[PDB]
Amino acid sequence: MVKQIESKTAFQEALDAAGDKLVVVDFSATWCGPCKMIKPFFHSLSEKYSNVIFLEVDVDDAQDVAPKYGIRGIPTLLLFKNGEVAATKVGALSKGQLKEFLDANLV
Template sequence: MGNCLNKSQSKDSDSDYHVEFAAGNVKLITTKEAWDQKSEEAKRDGKIVVANFTATWCGPCKMIAPLYSELSEKYTSFMFLLVDVDELADFSTSWDIKATPTFFFLKDGKEIDKLVGANKPELQKKLASVNDLIPQHDNQ
């Protein structure tokens, strides 16, 4: 449901690039060093990382981007990251990304859940269930 598997779609207009992928509290990751820095920050602060592996040419990615940004403002105890699979191709390959979008839920750098595809209800459900794992008044 809602997966982009490759770049065979045409890039017929630059208007496709004006979707705001990194709005709200979403942090755009453009280097491996930035990923490492944010991962360490999340560990230190006791935050769950939600990493969205996406692509600018991917229709389903564009469709779910506004919801992802909205959720980043609702779930402030999480750290929402955005990784462009084309900008960080080698890094994305190391995560075995087969389709975009792919969402990883990480605690202390370890995968605790994963969602492949732009399934809005499932993304919301996974966020709610992972949020239930976090002590609500934990001030680490």
């Protein structure tokens, strides 16, 4: 049921558990307002997908992962597939754009 990654090693570890499942993650911060707007809808989807893994990465704690992905801004939406990023979205988005984007990548 989603797992908060507070380290650069945890991100890799959580991905290993993802296997062939689609991993949609978000880069946020304690001072990120729009980021909190996706929290409610992001978590709900994870229960409505029963296939993909939704995790939470905070750049405040995961300051080592971002630099490795070259992320610059929040709320960033990252899509991982087989340990590799198969989609990169920046800024917040509605529930339909997130789901549509996911359904479009989840296969």
